[PDB]
Design a protein around this ligand. Structure first.
Ligand code: NO2
Ligand code: NO2
Ligand code: NO2
Ligand code: NO2
Ligand code: NO2
Ligand code: NO2
Ligand code: NO2
Ligand code: NO2
Ligand code: NO2
Ligand code: CU
Ligand code: CU
Ligand code: CU
Ligand code: CU
Ligand code: CU
Ligand code: CU
Lengths: 345, 345, 345
């Protein structure tokens, strides 16, 4: 019945994104994706705390899927028999059947094939949703990612001008709820089922123990900082399937930001900090103007610095002293300074 | 002095809305409403937990009032002598005197009549606000609802096109703060005054025990699901007088969303999830495209699935396989599948 | 190298703002500011609770700096040797070097001079950010303020009309994390270093003990209410460097609101409540229409009434009974009232 070309896409692990065209003159296709559920213990902080995670394709977040408006997206969801739980998938980009969840419930040892038409442009969350209390549990165990539905003509500024990125990164933010014992130390378990009761008690209090990018504190710092160059226009997709976030690029801005993440709306310009409402993806474009290290955070700085939610960019290029300069390096306060006469003393 | 026709409105219990015109060619009127405060014990979850509630017109939320720009709204607020506390009303739609609170304080056995001019379009919270710590306590005990001030020409898309709904529902979301005893079980009390001290201690920690629509977990599921039909344009008004929320229609979208709730602003288009800042109402229009069950949640899924904040729509009509289809039903993973060669293993 | 006139600005304590032009025909200048770090114990609530604070210029928030687009801002940051900790400054308005933090780290006894070009219009947070866990700690200890970068032609409505304020106020909101002892009473310390470990434990749970405007509960009530007059257009700048807020003017509205705080975007009109994402400043214009007391809150009313986050305006002028009137003062419910036949009983 649907007589369109079929194109298989090979996903890649975040924060990288599978190759794609921004603008295209190709017509609609059936874009074929495979997502394999993997339950596994994972390391989620710099002290080595482990967690009974649940993932699409082995990562937190699940990988970013990219299609264009009018494409059909045919997803083979696989639940290997080494897993212990049923799983399914809800695409916030899709129309009907709880975004697909009501058509994709699979037990370990099964797979299912769902097709949805990409009628809505933007970045959108996808996540597991088995039913009842299992919905938040699978999501906050790691079972969420995002899909981007680009306009066929690529992005624009809402005022008739095309916008093109030189580089794209996907930042999935994950709130985690890790039990502690009476001594205050994080607990370890041998299976997700064994971890559940204690984890639900932490979840109920709506305060995460960790807030991480790309699955762990420090994932996108150190050697895995995100690269860019002065002059590049970088698209930063940010998702949060369960909980609000407030992204900020330290030392930069959001030149064009779709806070609610939907490209039929013009972006806002020149933001300091934006807001990803829990259950959504948003996107920001920034053209780098200065070299050096940038931090990229949620701007609850307690979350950023103390619960894991800091990434880095390492940007190559030449410094622009017109934009910013250190006029005088740190020096002893002059002896003839008169600061004791200032109004606030 | 004010020589306009008077029109008495009979309110109805949420999530339904009293009948009204969208567009009107009638001129301004004095629209007369009566709100009667009722303090009473109410059931707020599926396990039968009770709560010492305070309400306008016996419901959480209070009923939705609907008027047009330029109408005058004359509210008779009644505090029967069976109540124990003073009460008043703040209309976020109104100008002056703390939205009316400073002109409406009534003791049990009294009533008061306030008139406010509907100069500002949108959906707006109304709530009790007696003074001091009694303000949050009366609000989170249930004393809040909403008023909609429509443009006289009805809604529009911000780009010169009229928008008309076939159906309207009012979803009032309530954060509740229910004390627990040392064994961890919710406590019961014989009066609101007796519940207050323990409730304030829960309030102070800014973590609700329950987050509910229409006054209780499960209120809008089961037999009280919200009805719609494929093709209908449904307006979903959502209020939260004290605390943020992030609404999402599972399997749908917000075609047109006034997140901040004010019709002088164009709506955003094609949202997955929107954001109701605490202390406001917002509104979303969606044209149903597929039949079946939809969930409507706050997309903190812990709140949705575990604290009470899930409603259902039951939508009649014919399924559209172009928008979404199950290409292959659940089946055993083929023996010749090669998933062990995937990049993430 | 930079051959522009230099203009020294004398800052003033919030909520007031140093004098400035809205529109200007002067060209770019080097606008010179001095900020002096002051660590000190401060009183943060109406019961006299003290706190080991860290400030710019002795206040929470730090003072509002005002410049125009294209100016250069040359900041001398001073860390007197009476302080105990290193400090620095991040301007969210600036481009490069972590907003300046990477060029301004100074030990007690030192000062540094940073210049940044004001290329981005709006209101923006500035805050200390020494590194690692010290970043949130210095911020939530009080080391944050804001800078406003006005367009050279002043504000406009996004639709080609100039907007001019008669009056400006800066409301800095501060989330505080004050330890308690086993008896539940706030603890006192002799230095910030001594307070740190216990404070970090409170911070980690992401629930403030206090949420205050201008540094303390009650700061902007009583004799320090904010003054205005009927007819004045008042700009209310609101910042929150670490945590979301939802401002609301009780009895008023936001006529024009830049929620994300950036003047290249048109303001929203007629808001009831707006949203300051943590890590940002926003701004609202309101033309007062009625005299009397107004409250200005975050509309988590628990925070507003119970944790400190209420300010007042005292507005002089004549009451407008067309906008609002008390039709009938409180009176006993008429004996012939029939409220027992209402639908909700
Ligand atoms: O150690 N993780 O369960
Ligand atoms: O669920 N959000 O903060
Ligand atoms: O601006 N750095 O938090
Ligand atoms: O049982 N409610 O107080
Ligand atoms: O008060 N809001 O999350
Ligand atoms: O999309 N359902 O959470
Ligand atoms: O009393 N303050 O540390
Ligand atoms: O960090 N904000 O609620
Ligand atoms: O509208 N006063 O919360
Ligand atoms: Cu799952
Ligand atoms: Cu969802
Ligand atoms: Cu009341
Ligand atoms: Cu209010
Ligand atoms: Cu500091
Ligand atoms: Cu910052």
């Amino acid at each position: 019945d649907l007589k369109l070309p079929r194109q298989r896409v090979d996903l890649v692990a975040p924060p990288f994104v599978h190759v794609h065209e921004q603008a295209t003159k190709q017509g609609p296709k059936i874009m074929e994706f495979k997502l394999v559920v993997q339950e596994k213990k994972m390391v989620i902080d710099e002290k080595g705390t482990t967690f009974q995670a649940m993932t699409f394709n082995g990562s937190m977040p699940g990988p970013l899927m990219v299609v264009h408006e009018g494409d059909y997206v045919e997803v083979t969801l696989v639940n290997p028999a080494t897993n212990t739980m049923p799983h399914n998938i809800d695409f916030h980009s899709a129309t009907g059947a709880l975004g697909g969840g009501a058509l994709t419930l699979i037990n370990p040892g099964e797979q299912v094939v769902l097709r949805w038409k990409a009628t809505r442009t933007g970045v959108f969350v996808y996540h597991c949703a088995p039913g009842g209390p299992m919905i938040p549990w699978h999501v906050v165990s790691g079972m969420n990612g995002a899909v981007m539905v680009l306009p066929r003509d690529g992005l624009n500024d809402g005022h008739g001008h095309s916008l093109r990125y030189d580089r794209i990164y996907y930042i999935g933010e994950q709130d985690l709820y890790v039990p502690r014992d009476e001594k205050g130390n994080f607990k370890s378990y041998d299976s997700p089922g064994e971890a559940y009761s204690d984890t639900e008690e932490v979840m109920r209090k709506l305060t995460p123990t960790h807030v991480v990018f790309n699955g762990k504190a420090g994932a996108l710092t150190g050697k895995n900082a995100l690269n860019a160059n002065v002059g590049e226009n970088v698209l930063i997709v940010h998702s949060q399937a369960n909980r609000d976030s407030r992204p900020h690029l330290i030392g930069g801005h959001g030149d064009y930001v779709w806070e609610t993440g939907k490209f039929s709306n013009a972006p806002e310009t020149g933001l300091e900090t934006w807001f990803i409402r829990g259950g959504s993806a948003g996107a920001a474009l920034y053209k780098f103007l200065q070299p050096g290290i940038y931090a990229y955070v949620t701007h609850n700085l307690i979350e950023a610095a103390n619960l894991g939610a800091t990434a880095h960019f390492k940007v190559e290029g030449k410094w622009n002293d017109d934009l910013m300069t250190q006029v005088k390096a740190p020096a002893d306060i002059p002896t003839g300074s008169t600061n004791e006469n200032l109004y606030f003393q």
